[PDB]
Design a protein around this ligand. Structure first.
Ligand SMILES: NC(=O)c1ccc[n+]([C@@H]2O[C@H](COP(=O)([O-])OP(=O)(O)OC[C@H]3O[C@@H](n4cnc5c(N)ncnc54)[C@H](OP(=O)(O)O)[C@@H]3O)[C@@H](O)[C@H]2O)c1
Ligand SMILES: CCc1nc(N)nc(N)c1OCCCOc1ncccc1/C=C/CO
Ligand SMILES: [Cl-]
Ligand code: NA
Length: 166
């Protein structure tokens, strides 16, 4: 459970088996099971994203509904209609439960404060290319639960991981 006086920080991302999460300003696959899982985990909570992840959402869909949207930017003139733009994790992590929803820069920024990671891994061979966004690497303070391989309606294998630490 999450006490209302606490500040719990989780990271949620989907990756190829290579660790790639983003390429050319987008996610280089689509997986409906992952979209549903992302919604199930984050609904009702604050979501924090980097400015480039805000840019990657079509204007018509943002801010993502049912969640307080917070965008990290260092640009004093960047504005996100419907959402709050802050310049640091300190300002972004004021809710009792926050999910950092990407991308690569912001996962690495938020990892020192996080105690949970929820990962979808898609079994698509997408090797790391220059400029890709990548999943954060998790050291031995993290302990993980790895689900068995499942099979999507779209014909891709995928599996879920849940990581925790103190
Ligand atoms: N597969 C997934 O789960 C997933 C999830 C989310 C995103 N993505 C993909 O990942 C890519 C985006 O990731 P990315 O690493 O390029 O960018 P990002 O992490 O989404 O955003 C980077 C921006 O965040 C701001 N920022 C970074 N560090 C900051 C700090 N310390 N303080 C304040 N603001 C800070 C900066 O904005 P300013 O430049 O405005 O200062 C920076 O340019 C896209 O391809 C996207 O589609 C994938
Ligand atoms: C559903 C993707 C996803 N999955 C997991 N597991 N964690 C995340 N942090 C995550 O990114 C959410 C922000 C980026 O969203 C999108 N970016 C590009 C194209 C489509 C979307 C989807 C929006 C809502 O379906
Ligand atoms: Cl969503
Ligand atoms: Na996930």
């Amino acid at each position: 459970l999450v006490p209302r006086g606490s500040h719990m920080v989780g990271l949620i991302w989907a990756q190829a088996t290579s660790g790639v999460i983003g390429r050319g300003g987008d996610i280089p696959w689509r997986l409906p099971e992952d979209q549903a899982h992302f919604r199930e985990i984050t609904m009702g909570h604050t979501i924090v994203m980097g400015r480039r992840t805000w840019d990657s959402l079509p204007a018509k869909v943002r801010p993502l509904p049912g969640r307080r949207n917070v965008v990290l930017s260092r640009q004093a003139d960047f504005m996100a209609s419907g959402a709050e733009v802050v310049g640091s994790l300190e300002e972004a992590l004021t809710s009792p439960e926050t999910w950092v929803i990407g991308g690569g820069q912001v996962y690495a920024l938020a990892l020192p404060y996080a105690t949970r990671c929820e990962v979808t891994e898609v079994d698509i061979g997408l090797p790391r290319e220059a400029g890709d966004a990548l999943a954060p690497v998790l050291d031995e303070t993290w302990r993980g639960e790895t689900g068995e391989w499942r099979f999507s309606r779209s014909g891709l294998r995928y599996r879920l991981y849940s990581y925790h630490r103190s």
